[PDB]
């Protein structure tokens, strides 16, 4: 269950459990505001939106999403919509471990500071 | 077990079972030269080396890593080594049914065309 995942997660953040496991939660890491959802069914994916520096190139860029050991690897990419970018990972929620959701967002912020304090965001 | 994952694969691409399964196997699907390999173990890796339309900023090919409904969409990367970019997707080999990996290679080829079957050995 993604309610049960969430929940799991937020004790492990020492965060309190709010009465509404909304669709979409927020979780702010020190300055970095995370959003964490199930999307499509049956898998849980994490993102924020990571400030970029100007001098990188697109190679440069591209770069940070090359395939590696960690399949929590955060993915860079570009939201044409809200006209910015979008640094997000992924995985299954049918294979959690108890683990495994902390360290997906811990991995995703790692990604951004490439580029804890908790609060329930 | 990656071997016989493979080896499904090949039954229904029509290509022959090649003796003794390597552990980058090449597959050609129309122009789009792919590979296939298990890594990290438990995991199934497919990638292409597509060629890129130079007038693409930053903003419009990173775009094409956005998020979807479907984890078999392909990732745009680069390699500073081998100074070019890949194309790539990965699903896990304990979750496979007997259509994913024909289906990993149909969105991996997909995703070569956006950035601009037959079947052989590579």
Redesign the interface.
Known sequence: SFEQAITQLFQQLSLSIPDTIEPVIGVKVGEFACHITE??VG?I?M?TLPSLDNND???????????S?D?LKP??????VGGH??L?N?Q?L??LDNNSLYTQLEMLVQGAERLRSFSHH
């Open positions: 999307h499509p898998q994916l993102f190139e697109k190679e440069t860029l591209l770069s940070h999403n090359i395939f050991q399949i993915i860079l990419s570009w939201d044409e970018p979008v997000w992924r299954p049918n294979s």
